[PDB]
Amino acid sequence: GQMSFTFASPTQVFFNGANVRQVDVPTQTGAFGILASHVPTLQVLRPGLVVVHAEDGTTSKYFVSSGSVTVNADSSVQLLAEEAVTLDMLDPGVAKANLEKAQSELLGAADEASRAEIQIRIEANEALVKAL
Amino acid sequence: IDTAAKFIGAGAATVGVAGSGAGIGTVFGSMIIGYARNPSLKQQLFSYAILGFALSEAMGLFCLMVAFLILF
Amino acid sequence: IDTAAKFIGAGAATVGVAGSGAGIGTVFGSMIIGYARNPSLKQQLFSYAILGFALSEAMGLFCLMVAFLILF
Amino acid sequence: IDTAAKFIGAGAATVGVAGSGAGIGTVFGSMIIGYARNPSLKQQLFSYAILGFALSEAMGLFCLMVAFLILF
Amino acid sequence: IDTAAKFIGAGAATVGVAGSGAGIGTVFGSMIIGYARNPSLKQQLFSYAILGFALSEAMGLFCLMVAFLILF
Amino acid sequence: IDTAAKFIGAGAATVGVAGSGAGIGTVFGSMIIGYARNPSLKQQLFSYAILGFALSEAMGLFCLMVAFLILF
Amino acid sequence: IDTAAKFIGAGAATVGVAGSGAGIGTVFGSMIIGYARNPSLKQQLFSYAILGFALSEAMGLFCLMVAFLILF
Amino acid sequence: IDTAAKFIGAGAATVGVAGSGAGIGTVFGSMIIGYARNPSLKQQLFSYAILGFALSEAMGLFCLMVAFLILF
Amino acid sequence: IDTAAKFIGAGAATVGVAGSGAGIGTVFGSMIIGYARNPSLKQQLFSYAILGFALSEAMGLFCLMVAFLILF
Amino acid sequence: VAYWRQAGLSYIRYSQICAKAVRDALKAEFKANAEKTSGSNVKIVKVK
Amino acid sequence: QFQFTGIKKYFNSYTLTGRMNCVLATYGGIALLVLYFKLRSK
Amino acid sequence: NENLFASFIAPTMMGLPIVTLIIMFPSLLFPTPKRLINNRTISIQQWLIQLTSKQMMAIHNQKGQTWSLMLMSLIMFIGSTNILGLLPHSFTPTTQLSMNLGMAIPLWSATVFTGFRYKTKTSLAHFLPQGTPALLIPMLVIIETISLFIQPVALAVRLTANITAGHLLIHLIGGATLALLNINTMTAFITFTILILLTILEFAVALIQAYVFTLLVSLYLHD
Amino acid sequence: ASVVPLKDRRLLEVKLGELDFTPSGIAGAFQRGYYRYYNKYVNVKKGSVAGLSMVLAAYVVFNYCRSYKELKHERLRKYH
Structure with missing residues (x-):
């Protein structure tokens, strides 16, 4: 709810500025779901997947090399990624x-x-x- | 002497209802800290508390039910 | 002899309120680490605090009514 | 006096389910604060909390089984 | 023999103050783990421990006053 | 007078196993929060809970064997 | 018979320290983890455990004072 | 009266040796939440558990001699 | 007559240690999760394990002090 | 804190490796996108 | 008698509060009396 | 019915032989040199003080640091007279409850009279914790004063009660070896329990930190 | 008799371990003190065992004398 899911990379901008429901974050100290009033935390990421949940039928699959979260005071999480690679090219x-x-x-x-x-x-x- | 064994079985069996009263402080304590992460509260976050609260009190009443059998 | 079994079980029942004294400690304890992250206090933190308090009481008070039932 | 020994034992062995009463209250106090990080609910998060309940209450229920043999 | 039950009755009736022993060991320890994460103690953080101390204390001295009033 | 001691003895000796269940809920209530942080289930984490149930029950089930030799 | 009921009268009231006997384990097990996260113990973060210990070991010897005053 | 007095001092002492089972629930159980944050496994991490496991059992096998001290 | 009352007043006095059989189980389980976060064990984190151990065994052993005095 | 800490490494050193460890695992059709990054362009000369 | 002037500067500094064994002494005298009293009545 | 334990019934005797020799004896274990370089057995005693004089100094940081040069003498006496007694037939003076009621009360009441000779009002106006609410003034100042007078009894009785509790498990687990002329396999396991328990009974050093330190906190808080 | 017992500790202490007289303890008479046990307490070089463990072996056998009257136990024979 009212959550601008920002997510990008230096090469090509991925799911950006769109109201998407639930994001998976692969992080040292585990993975934690972002639920619509999630508590702001500036934690950086470990290698792993992001399976991001929207109302468009089914979820997408990606893979972050080494990312960072900055979820802010309001409902706005910004995710970054050096290599937000797609899986099928592996x-x-x-x-x-x-x-x-x-x-x-x-x-x-x-x-x-x-x-x-x-x-x-x-x-x-x-x-x-x-x-x- | 026949009355005295009624009340030890009354007094000592009622003791065990203390334990399940300690348990529902945990599950209602844990719903306060689970909500402060992820406000998805009116979904199965709060509903798992009323799942757990009914299941712990069912044990404590099961303790208290022998107090009415063994006294009578 | 009738007073012998009465005066033990009234003390033997009120150890049941000790377990309510344990479960009431977490409910004002987890709300401390629950509110410490998330200062949204006037909302349903405290409303989930008072419900948690007055529910562990009712597993401690319910033995106490049964505790006075033994004496009379 | 021979019937009195029947009554005194089961009310004492009753209280061995008091801790097993609170021993299921914390396994639901985890799944509140466990699920609220990682919504992987219908998978083996909930399926493990089922197993922890039925194992622990069975060890409380066997404590009630010996209460019947002291009773009978 | 009437005073003999007056003495053993307050013997177990003051075990109910031990429940305010272990129940207060948490709510003073939870103001340790939840203070460092957020230094705002002069606000309602310390005030929700004093409510958490006193109203957990009120079930301590109540099970003390049973041991006086059972004896006299 | 031998019969009046054997039946209170084992029922007193059953009380302790309540201590076992009240810790054995923690050893799965730490694995719920364990796997929900880092999905390392099939590796060494789940096997510790298999050791964790096996260990603390051995502190528990021996106390039941204490009750049998009082009964026999 | 006045002497003998005193002998079991202080025996039941010995265990009032058993609440403070482990309630002091929690609060000194919660400054091992509150100094680990944020090394600022020299301020409030140590004096909130001794103040936690004073107001919880006030209740350990509180009950053994009664077990003395029932003995002599 | 001799074998009557001995056995109900022996069974009521063995309750305290499952009073340390609830500690190794925390000792063996809180290894889980430590191991998932950091896998430095064969370091002092598992070995600090042995300093917990055999010191908490050292209060478990404490009272068991004292029970057999009053068997004879 | 009080020869049994020598026993049970000692036989009930011993189970007040059953707190501190678990109270040191907290402080060693709560140290490894204070250690896996922050590997600086040679600092004051291990020094708060022993003072927490010693202050808990200080309230541990002197519950057995009242056990022998009822005997001897 | 983890094993890279108390060893002399950092996060930017962590990010250079698990980028390349992903980027070398690609198929031999998207190899040029691993050359799209190509961090070996900037040089370093010191004052002394 | 040189077990004095090595530590005589220390004494009148802190024995103003530290040398209050009067309470200790008073308690000891009372303790001896009660023991005698119970052995007097046996 | 394989392994039948035995027991022996014998009185456990804390007798009272000639004490004023036994008290003086752990003074002459520590020498003091009048030289610059010392002789490699005082030199590891001299280092061991330097450590724990830098932990009862750091908290106080006042002109109450004058008191702290005594508190390291208090740690060496019951640090030694609890460690000597682990020997075969030795006798500890801190076993008897007599001197510990003379170690608490002349030290504990030396603290409450320290601020009362300088502050005279706010030493026991430390009974006022905070910005006073109304419904709990009488419930407070009958509690925080009953947990003040407990402190001398709380300080001495915690020392005598667990020191002697170490000595009985030394005897009783040890005496069950001697009376184990039944099956000889279980004799070793009781012996192996002993040589673990004697390692735990070098927590008689660990219980002197919890006597000097809660004397500092009972000094730092008042002053 | 005071200068007799005072010259027992002073003479013994210098001879047993350490004091042109300070380095006399640097070699030490620990090589002289060594041969009593078997060989095993070899660590006496700067933490000197045989300097200390003789007093504590003297204080045990001195306290074995007082206990001897109470724990008699001996038959009309000798032990194994």
Whole structure:
């Protein structure tokens, strides 16, 4: 109700300024539904889907690489995304071998900074394989 | 001596109605904090409270029902 | 001997109001962390606070009427 | 006096369902504050809260089953 | 033997003040977790704990006054 | 006088299992809020609730075995 | 018979601390989490737990004073 | 009178050892809400649970010797 | 005659510890969710686990103080 | 706070990787849109 | 007697309030008397 | 009917031998050097004070810091005389309830007379908490004064009651080993329970933080 | 007899662990104190066990004497 669902990207503007009902936000500390008087929170996002709910028959499916919420004082949530990619342009065959690749390179990290980074890489690669 | 066993079974059985009175403070406490996230309240947010409130009191009355059987 | 069983069960019943003392604590406790996020207080926060208070009482007061029923 | 031992035991074993009465009051105090983040309701959010109820009240109901054997 | 029931009756009747023991341990702990998220204590945040303290206290001293009035 | 002790003993020994159900509602009432934050169900989270029901009931069901040796 | 009923008279009133015996566990388990979120304990956020402890351990030894005054 | 007095001091002591089952409901249960925010699993996270699990059982197996202290 | 009253007045005094068997269950379950948010355990967060433990066991053991005095 | 914290990394470092980890997972029809971003254009020269 | 002037500057600072064992002393005397009283009546 | 526990009935004796030797003895465990560099066994005693003198100093931050050089002597005495007694046949003076009623009351009443010699009005006008409502003035100042006089009894009885409670489970779990000339498998498990319980009974150091600290809060609040 | 017991602690303390006299305890007589247990308390280098654990072994056997009268228990024989 009375909610301007803003959502975009640097390449192409997605669902923008339209009164859409419910948005899924993929976020560290989990996913939380936006229900029409949602409490304002400036939390940034983790990799995952956004399944956005409108009255137009059925829901759409997208995928955010690394986004940010700024839901304001009134009923206006603005979502951003670096890569709000569509799912169907993804190739499963090369995507699986990446997950076993980085775990095979975990113990080749002689420093402490990159050892978190390969833990980032498998988490981003685990994010897509449950999705697909 | 025959009257004295009536009242211990009256006094000790009525004790258990305290527990379910503690439970409906939780579910009505939790509806206050669930609403403060997502004002979709008149939908199944509030309706799950009256789901839960009737189900906990049904246990506490089930405790209190033996107080009228064992006394009589 | 008749006064022996009467004077225990009247004390044995009023431990039932202890459980109401527990469930009444959360209802003014969760409303503290319920209102702390969302200052929409004059709306249905407090109206859900007073209903939660006077419903846990009725599982504590209902034993108390039964508690005085034992004495008379 | 032999019949008196029947009466004193079940009113004591009655109260073992008081905590199991409040032990189902909190599993509904979660699903209020659980659903109000993530509307995935008809899926395994509600289906798990069904299982937590019938398991816990059964362990309260077996506490009432021993109340009958002390009674009979 | 009449005074013998006067003593054991107030023995369990003051267990009802323990319900105002654990029920007050929450509502003073909930003004910890819900203060840091929103520093507005001089407004109705502290005032809804004093209502939450006193009206939770009123069921504490009421189950104390039973133990006096059962004995005298 | 042996019969008057065996029946009050086991019914007193049944009281504690109310403590078990009042915690065992929490171990699924934390998994409702657990899965609703991060859908990690089929991994280690749900198996902890399988351990969580199995552990605290072992604190509970032994107390019932205490009641049997008083009865037998 | 005056001495013997005093012996069980203070035995039932021992457990009045059992409310404060775990009500002090909650409020000191709610400043572990209110200092974790916002490190500002040196202000109100520690003096609201000792003030929580004073007004909740006022009721632990409050009842054992009665269990003494029923004994001697 | 000898075996009458012993057993109802033994069963009424074993109620307190399921009084610590309601704590490990929180100890084993509040691992769930911590594990979902952060999966640093084989860190002190699961090991702080063992400092909770065996210290809360250490008040559980506290009173069980005291019951067998008054068995003999 | 009071030889049993030596027992049950001690046998009822022991279940007042059953609060603090759960009250330390809070403060260790409530520490891991204060820790998984903020991994700074060597700071004052762990120091509030032990003072919360010690102040709860201070109200824990001295309920067994009144147990032995009724015996000895 | 997570494992990237207390390790020396940040959010902009987090966003560069899980963009590329998505953008390398594409089919070989939309490869040029991964070249549409092409962050390797700006150079860095220091004063010293 | 040099267990004094090492800590004599400390004493008249805080023994103005700290050296009030009179209450402690009064309680002790009373405590001894009650014990004697109960053993007098056995 | 496999594993039958046994028990032994024997009196548990807190006797009273010659005490004024036993009190003086944990003073001579700590030496004091008149040298710049010390000798690597005082040097880890001297470091251990530096720590916990920086936590009973930080809260107060007044000209009530003069009092705090005594409060670290109070922590070393019952820090030591609770840790000596874990030995086989030693005797703790903080077992008996006598001296603890002489440790509370000359210290607790040294606090309420500290502000009454300087402030004289607002020390116990701390009984006025807030912007006074009407229906609960008499319900308040009969409560916040009955939880003041509890404090000396609340301070001493919490120390004597759990220290001795450690010693009985040392005996009774230990004495059930000796009288376990039945099946020998369960003897080890009672022994393994003991050597866990002796680790928990080094919370006799942890119970001295909860004696100096609630003496500070009962000093910081009044002054 | 006061200068007799005072010269027991002073002489013993310097000899047992630490004091041209301060570094005499830097090597320490802990190598002399070592051989009594078996070898295992090896950590006495700067937290010195054998310096402290002798007094506490003396205070135990001193308190075994007072308890001996009460817990007699001995038959008309010896034990195993």
